[PDB]
Amino acid sequence: SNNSIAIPTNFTISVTTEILPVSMTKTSVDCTMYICGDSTECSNLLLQYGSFCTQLKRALTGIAVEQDKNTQEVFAQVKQIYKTPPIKYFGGFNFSQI
Amino acid sequence: QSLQTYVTQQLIRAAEIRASANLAATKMSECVLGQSKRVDFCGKGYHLM
Amino acid sequence: FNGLTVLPPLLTDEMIAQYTSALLAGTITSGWTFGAGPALQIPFPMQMAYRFNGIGVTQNVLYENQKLIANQFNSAIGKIQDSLSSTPSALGKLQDVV
Amino acid sequence: SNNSIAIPTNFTISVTTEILPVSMTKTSVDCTMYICGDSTECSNLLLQYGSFCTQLKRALTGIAVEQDKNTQEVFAQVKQIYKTPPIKYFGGFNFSQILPDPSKPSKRSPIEDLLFNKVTKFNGLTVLPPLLTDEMIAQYTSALLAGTITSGWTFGAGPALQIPFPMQMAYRFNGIGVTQNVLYENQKLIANQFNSAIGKIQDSLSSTPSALGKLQDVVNHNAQALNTLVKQLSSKFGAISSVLNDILSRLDPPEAEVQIDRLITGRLQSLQTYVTQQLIRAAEIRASANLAATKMSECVLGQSKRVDFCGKGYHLMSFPQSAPHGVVFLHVTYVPAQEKNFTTAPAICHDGKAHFPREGVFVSNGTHWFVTQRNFYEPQIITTDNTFVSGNCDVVIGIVNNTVYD
Amino acid sequence: LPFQQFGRDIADTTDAVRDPQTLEILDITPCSFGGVSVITPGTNTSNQVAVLYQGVNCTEVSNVFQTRAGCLIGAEYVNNSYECDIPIGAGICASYQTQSQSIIAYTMSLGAENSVAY
Ligand SMILES: *[C@@H]1O[C@H](CO)[C@@H](O)[C@H](O)[C@H]1NC(C)=O
Ligand SMILES: *[C@@H]1O[C@H](CO)[C@@H](O)[C@H](O)[C@H]1NC(C)=O
Ligand SMILES: *[C@@H]1O[C@H](CO)[C@@H](O)[C@H](O)[C@H]1NC(C)=O
Ligand SMILES: *[C@@H]1O[C@H](CO)[C@@H](O)[C@H](O)[C@H]1NC(C)=O
Ligand SMILES: *[C@@H]1O[C@H](CO)[C@@H](O)[C@H](O)[C@H]1NC(C)=O
Ligand SMILES: *[C@@H]1O[C@H](CO)[C@@H](O)[C@H](O)[C@H]1NC(C)=O
Ligand SMILES: *[C@@H]1O[C@H](CO)[C@@H](O)[C@H](O)[C@H]1NC(C)=O
Ligand SMILES: *[C@@H]1O[C@H](CO)[C@@H](O)[C@H](O)[C@H]1NC(C)=O
Ligand SMILES: *[C@@H]1O[C@H](CO)[C@@H](O)[C@H](O)[C@H]1NC(C)=O
Ligand SMILES: *[C@@H]1O[C@H](CO)[C@@H](O)[C@H](O)[C@H]1NC(C)=O
Ligand SMILES: *[C@@H]1O[C@H](CO)[C@@H](O)[C@H](O)[C@H]1NC(C)=O
Ligand SMILES: *[C@@H]1O[C@H](CO)[C@@H](O)[C@H](O)[C@H]1NC(C)=O
């Protein structure tokens, strides 16, 4: 209505949870080992095939450095390692769970 | 062909993980290191901590 | 084990835990000051008062109701652990990545 | 401790550098020239093969238009070209390092010249020039800088409203929670700090080449992809020879068909891999360019309250600079310094009433209680002008006794 | 060196050849190749088209104009600057302008000049 308002008279302190992925597993593949391993003439003919091994290795290395950079960006915000005081009293707030 | 398909799928998933990690870094900077005025960015309700 | 290897992450779980502890200690003891410069010590009730003032509620509201807000926060934090434990789907994103 | 606070007594104006890629090299390929050269029979066999050429051409053209759109989104925020007044006085603030230099024909700032100096085939591969030249991007940057210097954040939200620079920085201080009297008292010191930081930025960029590593990484990745394609053009893929003229001058048609099929399959696979990698890199470049556009809107065209989004510390200003295939942001922030210990109380008990500060904190030097603003130590006598009662004395925890002057 | 006959570049392509009968070195350069872009308005508006030969010196291929993108034929360069209609190349855009209804090429205008009284 054009004359009425609703005003809160109390409050609730609500804690919610948000889960976010940051990094994934860093994997490396040996193209020669996967395709044929110890088969020498297979390795020779794979060499004749092209230079796909180098590109695959570059892509995986980039992914690995990417994951390390992801973790660093998320968690290395602070430059100093802050330590909580020995007496854990914060005006009745209980942080022992965190 | 199998290994190329694996690497391409890994690249796509790595892009998804970069998106998630950038979001996590922004939320660490804006929800943890300060109080955020953005609605629904730092939880539901008026963000305190 | 036929050419595929997993490279360990650069930061260990202990190091990420130390980063998290540093962030928590900074937030509890300094407010938002440590993210913009030197860590400026401040009592936690005053930090909560200024955070209340940030969302448009005067600090008298916090100071009058310090015990109630502390109890609500402690109850919510305690319930977070049970909510995480009871529902395995809460951590579904990390498990999906794995 | 539950009684002590730390209040800054000084500050530093800091300028930090953020380098963001915006666009990458626009490349076009001709499927027929790459796969078959001028061999007509190879062209006919490729026509019989399928319709991948049009799809690859569509993907590459999409990437090119994508790059042009990225540059337009980042740098075309303004609709008018703003010129700084001929007399370059802004209350002691020196923007010569940031503003374009008339002497150089390129009309680029010295920092832009440093950036351009630091970060610096015919088998069917072509490189298309960007729609906007380096001079045009420099003119966008100059217009943004002139608008920010002369009008503040007004030109981004409407007509450009002129304002003296000290008043603009005073309102920015008021935005970060510091009263304008601080700037009006310490104008010379703040201008000197800003000038020193701007002067140090150029030396910092010159000393560490890793600062511009992202743009050079983009260039290197594009070059590596093109070189890999050209090298794959010299593979055999099972064929006896890697030259179509050789396979046509040595063999009859029907038996040369199998070798030319092998060459076509290998080269199609190589070119498709190149296109897929280009698409993924283009996605990364879109992400970076959207981030750069958001920073230009929020850091340069206004004051951002988001923490760590525009530099480290309380954000005051941001200045853009064009770099080859990217942007550089000079974030000017306020870093408190020279902190001091003080004893603080939530409230002051006077006449049986609790008193709270309207803005600021209660600070004791041991003997007397004052009220200060939060981010800077300016003690003032606790009066009813800067306090409100709203309560009773017994309920508040930690209240202290003192007199509130009328 | 007096013993080798072929020369190759980083791309493993034949770049130089020693002539058999007379002993001199000849540099081989692939004769001009490029792409062709057709610049047109809507077919309903008109059927006039301009042709941009990309990366080609305009000798190898109001009539002709030399853009850093390539050689543009069918477009008249005008020293007036307008807002970009359809992109051509490094700062040059084409449009269908009456002013003489034809396709004109021009350096694009970034925006209206404005000098705020500071
Ligand atoms: C609200 O709007 C109605 C419209 O019919 C009007 O009759 C009424 O007077 C308005 N009330 C107030 C308090 O303005
Ligand atoms: C607010 O809710 C709490 C929880 O039940 C209660 O203890 C308190 O009295 C309420 N406050 C008011 C003003 O009703
Ligand atoms: C809460 O605080 C009390 C007193 O310090 C402590 O014993 C307890 O472990 C804390 N946490 C929980 C989960 O109750
Ligand atoms: C402050 O903390 C100390 C911890 O030793 C405690 O003894 C004291 O009662 C506290 N003062 C308060 C809560 O006002
Ligand atoms: C603040 O710092 C500057 C430079 O560090 C110094 O010149 C000035 O005296 C300082 N001001 C105070 C009040 O200490
Ligand atoms: C500061 O400005 C003056 C003129 O306004 C100029 O001569 C000087 O070079 C500037 N400082 C720097 C470091 O360029
Ligand atoms: C405040 O006092 C504590 C305790 O003596 C000390 O550790 C800290 O360095 C002091 N801080 C300042 C800014 O004086
Ligand atoms: C506190 O400030 C008052 C007012 O300036 C002054 O009279 C008093 O001596 C100061 N006390 C100390 C210990 O500095
Ligand atoms: C100061 O205020 C407190 C309230 O917490 C009161 O108990 C004390 O008696 C007061 N001191 C006086 C009136 O001298
Ligand atoms: C025949 O061979 C000799 C080899 O030295 C060469 O000099 C000469 O020019 C050749 N003949 C002609 C007509 O070119
Ligand atoms: C290439 O084009 C330019 C355009 O200015 C011209 O000067 C040059 O002579 C041309 N080169 C040739 C004809 O190969
Ligand atoms: C237009 O610009 C060209 C290139 O600078 C110049 O040659 C020509 O004379 C100009 N036409 C004018 C100024 O009318």
The DSSP string of D242-254 is S-HHHHHHHS-HH
Kindly give the pairing relationship between strand D353-357 and strand D387-388. antiparallel
In a 3-state reduction of DSSP, which class is residue D93?
Answer: coil
Give phi and psi for E82, each to the nearest 5.
-125, 175
Counting one residue from chain C and one from chain D, the pairs whose CB atoms sit within 8 A come to: 72
Q: Which residue of D has its CA nearest to C58?
A: D358
Measured between alpha carbons, how far is D206 from D212 in angstroms, rounded to an integer?
10
User: Token pair 């914060």 is at which residue?
Assistant: A90
Instruction: Inspect the interface and report whether the beta carbons of B27 and A35 lie closer than 8 Å.
Output: no
Instruction: Say if residues C84 and C78 touch (Cβ distance below 8 Å).
Output: no
Burial class (CB in 10 A: 0-12, 13-18, 19+), C54: middle
Measured between alpha carbons, how far is C40 from A30 in angstroms, rounded to an integer?
52
Counting one residue from chain A and one from chain C, the pairs whose CB atoms sit within 8 A come to: 129
Instruction: Inspect the interface and report whether the beta carbons of D131 and E91 lie closer than 8 Å.
Output: yes
In a 3-state reduction of DSSP, which class is residue D350?
Answer: strand
User: Token pair 């030249």 is at which residue?
Assistant: D133
Instruction: Say if residues C48 and C31 touch (Cβ distance below 8 Å).
Output: no
The method of structure determination was: cryo-EM
**Cβ neighbours for E102, distance < 8 A, ≥ 6 positions apart:** E48, E76, E96
DSSP H/E element including D370: strand D369-372
Chain B environment of C23 (Cβ under 8 Å): 28, 32-33
Measured between alpha carbons, how far is E36 from B29 in angstroms, rounded to an integer?
50
Instruction: Say if residues A15 and C80 touch (Cβ distance below 8 Å).
Output: yes
Ligand having the closest approach to the CA of D8: 7
Length of chain A: 98
- Distance between start and end Cα atoms, chain B: 50
Instruction: Inspect the interface and report whether the beta carbons of B19 and D309 lie closer than 8 Å.
Output: no
Q: Which residue of B has its CA nearest to D277?
A: B8
**Binding site membership of A96 for ligand 3 (Cβ less than 6 Å):** yes
DSSP H/E element including A56: helix A52-75
Chain A environment of B14 (Cβ under 8 Å): 24, 63, 66-67
Instruction: Say if residues D5 and D342 touch (Cβ distance below 8 Å).
Output: yes
Chain C environment of A90 (Cβ under 8 Å): 28, 44
CA of E41 relative to ligand 12 center, distance in Å: 26
Measured between alpha carbons, how far is D73 from D71 in angstroms, rounded to an integer?
5
Measured between alpha carbons, how far is D368 from D347 in angstroms, rounded to an integer?
14
Q: Torsion over CA of D213, D216, D220 and D222, rounded to 10 degrees?
A: 120
Report DSSP letters for chain C, one per residue. Answer: --SEEEEPPSS-HHHHHHHHHHHHHHHHHHTTGGGSSS-----HHHHHHHHHHHTT--HHHHHHTHHHHHHHHHHHHHHHHHHHHH-GGGGHHHHHH-
Instruction: Say if residues C73 and A96 touch (Cβ distance below 8 Å).
Output: no
Q: Which residue of B has its CA nearest to A17?
A: B43
- Which structure tokens are listed for A32? 């020669």
SS (H, E, C) C25-45: HHHHHHCCHHHCCCCCCCCHH
For residue A26, give the nearest of C9, D401, B7 by alpha carbon: C9
Distances (CA, A) of A73 to A18, A22, B21, D259, D308: 18, 9, 8, 51, 12
Measured between alpha carbons, how far is D82 from D80 in angstroms, rounded to an integer?
6
Instruction: Inspect the interface and report whether the beta carbons of D280 and B12 lie closer than 8 Å.
Output: yes
Chain A environment of D270 (Cβ under 8 Å): 50
Mutation target for A interface from C10, C13, C18: give the one with most A CBs within 10 A. Answer: C10
For ligand 7, what atom is nearest to the CA of residue D339?
Answer: 13
D105 interfaces chain E, CB cutoff of 8 Å: no
Q: Which long-range contacts (CB under 8 A, 24 or more apart) does D381-385 make?
A: D381/D405, D382/D348, D382/D355
In the DSSP assignment, the letter for residue E30 is P
To one decimal place, what's the resolution in Å?
A: 2.9
Burial class (CB in 10 A: 0-12, 13-18, 19+), D346: buried
Touching chains B and A? (3+ Cβ pairs < 8 A): yes
Distances (CA, A) of C48 to C28, D398, E31: 10, 15, 75
- Which residues make beta-bridge pairs with A78? none
Mutation target for A interface from C41, C65, C73: give the one with most A CBs within 10 A. Answer: C73
Give phi and psi for D7, each to the nearest 5.
-115, 130
**Binding site membership of D97 for ligand 6 (Cβ less than 6 Å):** yes
CA of A93 relative to ligand 3 center, distance in Å: 10
Residues ending a continuous segment of chain E before a break (C–N > 2.5 Å) = 61, 99
Mutation target for B interface from A31, A66, A78: give the one with most B CBs within 10 A. Answer: A66
In a 3-state reduction of DSSP, which class is residue E113?
Answer: strand
| E74 phi-psi bin (left φ>0, alpha ψ -120 to 50, beta other) | left
Instruction: Inspect the interface and report whether the beta carbons of B22 and A63 lie closer than 8 Å.
Output: no
Instruction: Say if residues B45 and B31 touch (Cβ distance below 8 Å).
Output: no
CA of E5 relative to ligand 10 center, distance in Å: 16
DSSP H/E element including B4: helix B2-27
Q: Could you tell me which residues of chain A have a Cβ less than 8 Å from any Cβ in chain B?
A: 13-14, 16, 18, 20-24, 27, 29, 31, 34-35, 52, 56, 59-60, 63, 66-67, 70-71, 73-75, 77
Instruction: Inspect the interface and report whether the beta carbons of C76 and A37 lie closer than 8 Å.
Output: no
In the DSSP assignment, the letter for residue D387 is E
Q: Which residue of D has its CA nearest to B36?
A: D306
Q: Could you tell me which residues of chain B have a Cβ less than 8 Å from any Cβ in chain C?
A: 17, 28-29, 32-35, 37, 46-49
**Cβ neighbours for D306, distance < 8 A, ≥ 6 positions apart:** B29, B30, B34, B36, D298, D315
Which of E21, E23, E24 is the best mutation target for the ligand 10 pocket, counting ligand atoms within 8 Å of the beta carbon and taking the most?
E21
In a 3-state reduction of DSSP, which class is residue D362?
Answer: strand
In degrees, rounded to 5, the angle at the alpha carbon of residue D314 between the alpha carbons of residues D311 and D318 is 50
Chain A environment of C93 (Cβ under 8 Å): 19-21
- Which structure tokens are listed for D318? 């941001």
For residue D25, give the nearest of D323, D226, D288, D231 by alpha carbon: D226
In a 3-state reduction of DSSP, which class is residue D177?
Answer: coil
Nearest CA to ligand 9 atom 1: D401
Q: Torsion over CA of C34, C35, C37 and C38, rounded to 10 degrees?
A: 10
